[PDB]
Design a protein around this ligand. Sequence first.
Ligand SMILES: [Zn+2]
Ligand SMILES: [Zn+2]
Ligand SMILES: [Zn+2]
Ligand SMILES: [Zn+2]
Lengths: 73, 70
Amino acid sequence: PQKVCLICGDEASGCHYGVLTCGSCKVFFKRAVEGQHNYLCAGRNDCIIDKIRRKNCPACRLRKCLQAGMTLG
Amino acid sequence: KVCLICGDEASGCHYGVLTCGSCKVFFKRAVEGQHNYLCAGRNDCIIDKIRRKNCPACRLRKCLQAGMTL
DNA sequence: CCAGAACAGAGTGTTCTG
DNA sequence: TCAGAACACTCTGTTCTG
Ligand SMILES: [Zn+2]
Ligand SMILES: [Zn+2]
Ligand SMILES: [Zn+2]
Ligand SMILES: [Zn+2]
């Protein structure tokens, strides 16, 4: 029955900012939208985002967050 | 004057290849240490001063292909 | 100069709270 | 229920040292 993060496939802690996610992707999304970051993809803007590689490309991670419908209101 | 790994300003010839300091210490730490680097793209990730943190796997790959060794 | 050590920061992830 | 605070850890890069 266990719930899965729609961003990285890790265990989802709950519905955060409109989307079923884990804590890491939650706080990441908050920090990313509000914070001033220089995220730039090194691939083709389609990087695989899972528990191991989510640290690799913050750009694609934020992209998946936004496309999932995450918002702060 | 330019790092053959990320194109940043090269500090000198390290481990056999003209590199900067960051790629020097990165290479040593990567080779000796037990890391779980995994590429999220297609093994052709752009490694420059801005994005070199993104894919350690491809960075290490460029180091090895450059001939770096201990 | 070059190798290695050591110090410091960015980014991240978990725990705790209401 | 979920949002936010805050501490702690990993990885990295510069400075220091032999
Ligand atoms: Zn997640
Ligand atoms: Zn990417
Ligand atoms: Zn370099
Ligand atoms: Zn890569």
